[PDB]
């Protein structure tokens, strides 16, 4: 029961964001040990109707208030660029920024993905971009 | 500068979720004092491209780990019911559950809103539902 021991004290030191879009979950945030990072993934994967989980939680101290506000501003800037985009729609992707990493998740076609990649290069205050896009034009695997 | 004093210590005691959909922001979570709750709203409202902010942060202790996992499961259950719904689409609303309160936000027409209300009555483990829906069929105000 090591991953449950003193869970309350460890979670008080944590920030855990759980964001779902369709049946895919993005985990971001900060926890004090790898046991809690894995527990969060295990617990989310066990939820009904969850298909895939992307666990980008880090093991380390919680980020500062100014960081989450800067992160939110990056996300707001990205959403504004998306609703202005020619092809890709703002409704079709989830956008989250955690500690300067811009995450974009959703289901798009190839034309929409190319537009999205063009938009994301225009976002400031981003150290890394992680796209989690399922291309709906990909042929399904054979039986 | 009372709302900034010892901000780092106060934010360590906090959970602040900032979720945007189109140009509307939902704030949920827990902070130790009303000054931080108001500061979060002021800082989010100041971001470029933010039109409306719904501040549902509470002043109190951070919720437990088991609570955020139960909350996520409510959200996952709601998303599953939405993608099965006849009229309303899962892509058109943002769903978030915080401490047993189900928040649904987005832009819908009347038919989609009626379907949504039918779906939300079928979600368990919810003490309160807060819909933040803009009905796109509402006539715009006169000049
Ligand atoms: Zn879906
Ligand atoms: Zn894994
Ligand atoms: Zn992944
Ligand atoms: Zn987010
Ligand atoms: Zn929009
Ligand atoms: Zn206010
Ligand atoms: Zn409101
Ligand atoms: Zn949420």
Residue numbers in the entry:
A (entry chain A), B (entry chain A): 9 to 151
The authors write:
High-quality crystals were only obtained for N-terminally truncated BonA, missing the 27 amino acids (aa) after its lipid-anchoring cystine. The structure of this protein, designated BonA-27N, was solved at 1.65 Å by single-wavelength anomalous dispersion (SAD) phasing, using selenomethionine labeled protein. The crystal structure of BonA-27N consists of two α/β-sandwich BON domains that interact extensively via the external face of their three-strand β-sheets. In contrast to the structure of DolP in which both domains adopt a canonical BON domain fold, in the BonA structure, α-helix 1 (αH1) of BON domain 1 (BON1) does not adopt the expected BON domain conformation of running parallel to the BON domain β-sheet. Rather, it is displaced from the rest of the domain. The 39 aa of the C-terminal extension of BonA-27N (aa 196 to 235) are disordered in the crystal structure. Analysis of BonA-27N crystallographic symmetry reveals that it exists as a dimer, aligned with the crystallographic 2-fold axis. The interface is stabilized by αH1 of BON domain 2 (BON2), which substitutes for the displaced αH1 of BON1, thus completing the α/β-sandwich fold of BON1. This interaction of αH1 of BON2 with BON1 is largely mediated by hydrophobic interactions, with Tyr118 and Met122 of αH1 of BON2 extending deeply into a hydrophobic pocket created by the displacement of αH1 of BON1. The interface also contains two symmetrical, highly solvated pockets, which trap a total of 34 water molecules, as well as two Zn2+ ions which were present at a high concentration in the crystallization solution.
